[PDB]
């Protein structure tokens, strides 16, 4: 009965040269029992990408909530929300439920359309912002991901190289966690094209 480790799963985001990458596993289980091998944890609202690990009902609820909020934002502002702004919206929304929180580990990723700067951010469950140049990690294999990223990562990787680094980071971390894996998805995000790749990984 630890909400953050019932369903299990991981998200990782990295920055490269004029690009960002965000990747997640596909497992949804009920503790030991694997239930779904199609449960994606990465969503997008325009050009801003959000990964969410933790209790799956809250992953779904928050996605539906941020779609709701970004839609009204776009109608009133007459433009798509930027990663820096969305990061603040996520933080506000999470801390609104400070004494009854969503059991989630969200990760924002995207490129600012005006400045062209790669941006990534992580949050705790109460909504504290963790901004990083290099990488953000989240989920049941966060320790493993921290170890993989900190050793594998180097600055200013090209999109094709960054893909290999984030993919190897996720795969090797997920294989050392019981509640993570069962397939993976990697988003490579450039200024005005986004490639989505499904990885082949061991299915245990």
């Amino acid at each position: 009965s630890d909400p953050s480790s019932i369903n299990g799963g991981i998200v990782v985001a990295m920055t490269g040269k004029d690009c960002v990458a965000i990747a997640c596993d596909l497992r949804l289980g009920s503790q030991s029992l694997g239930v779904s091998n199609k449960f994606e944890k990465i969503f997008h609202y325009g050009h801003v990408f959000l990964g969410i690990t933790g209790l799956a009902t809250d992953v779904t609820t928050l996605n539906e909530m941020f779609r709701y909020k970004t839609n009204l934002y776009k109608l009133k502002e007459e433009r798509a929300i930027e990663p820096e702004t969305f990061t603040q919206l996520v933080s506000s929304s999470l801390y609104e439920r400070r004494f009854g929180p969503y059991f989630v580990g969200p990760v924002v990723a995207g490129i600012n359309s005006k400045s062209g700067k790669p941006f990534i951010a992580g949050f705790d469950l109460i909504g504290c912002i963790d901004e990083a140049k290099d990488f953000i990690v989240s989920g049941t294999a966060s320790d493993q991901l921290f170890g993989m990223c900190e050793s594998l990562y180097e600055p200013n990787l090209e999109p094709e190289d960054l893909f290999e680094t984030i993919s190897q980071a996720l795969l090797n971390a997920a294989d050392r966690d019981a509640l993570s894996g069962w397939g993976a998805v990697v988003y490579i995000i450039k200024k005005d094209e986004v490639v989505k790749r499904y990885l082949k990984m061991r299915q245990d």
Partner: peptide, 4 residues
């Protein structure tokens, strides 16, 4: 959560 986070602490500093």
């Amino acid at each position: 959560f986070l602490w500093x």
